[PDB]
């Protein structure tokens, strides 16, 4: 029902768990290096970009976003992505975004 992904602050998939095949049809190697906004419905792209910008300012708090993701089977799936930044406190490396992506009902 869900998969984990890791993104850079720009939205690029840098890690994708294999449960993505059952959820959105794509293999992890088909998502890696691509931006999440490239799979997002044009009406939801600005909301998804604003949410990635804001999750960085919320100190590890979860930020959820609902948007339509274009699956490999050519359907717009409603996805609920719960994201939070992670920054290893022993370092000053740029934070990355951790996401849990679930196909949910818009009802």
């Amino acid at each position: 029902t869900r998969f984990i992904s890791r993104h850079n602050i720009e939205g690029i998939f840098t890690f994708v768990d294999h449960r993505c095949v059952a959820t959105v049809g794509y293999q992890p190697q088909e998502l890696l290096g691509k931006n999440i906004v490239e799979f997002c419905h044009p009406e939801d792209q600005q909301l998804l970009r604003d949410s990635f910008q804001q999750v960085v300012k919320l100190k590890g708090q979860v930020l959820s976003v609902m948007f339509r993701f274009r699956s490999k089977n050519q359907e717009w799936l409603w996805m609920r992505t719960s994201s939070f930044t992670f920054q290893n406190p022993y370092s000053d490396e740029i934070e990355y975004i951790i996401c849990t992506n679930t196909n949910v009902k818009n009802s």
């Binding site: 590890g60 979860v62 959820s64 609920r80 719960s82």
Partner: protein, 112 residues
């Protein structure tokens, strides 16, 4: 040579009872476990007995606050011995708890 912070970090996912529902492949080169042999097993089975009470309290705090940073704790490695870790756990709720996302960092010196 020893591993850096990023290479010593692995993600895990858990149901609300601490059982593993997902584990990143990076755990294998750090702790010896293959993700598949961890599924369905409680994280508690791997804590060193001297950290079990502290981990119970960290789980209770995580369940009430939604996010927690564990203290330093020991996790039993596959072929014996204990490795020191620190985890940032986060509860993924339905905006009702669905699961716990862990970002696990190995504190111990790991070669390569």
């Amino acid at each position: 040579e020893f591993k850096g912070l990023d290479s010593k970090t692995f993600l895990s996912e858990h149901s609300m009872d601490m059982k593993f529902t997902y584990c990143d492949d990076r755990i294998t080169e750090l702790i010896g476990y293959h993700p598949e042999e961890l599924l369905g097993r409680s994280a508690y089975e791997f804590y060193h007995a001297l950290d079990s009470e502290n981990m119970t309290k960290s789980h209770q705090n995580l369940c009430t606050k939604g996010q927690v940073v564990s203290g330093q704790y020991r996790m039993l490695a596959k072929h014996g011995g204990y490795v020191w870790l620190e985890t940032q756990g986060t509860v993924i709720y339905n905006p009702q708890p669905q699961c716990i996302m862990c970002v696990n960092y190995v504190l111990s010196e790991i070669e390569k």
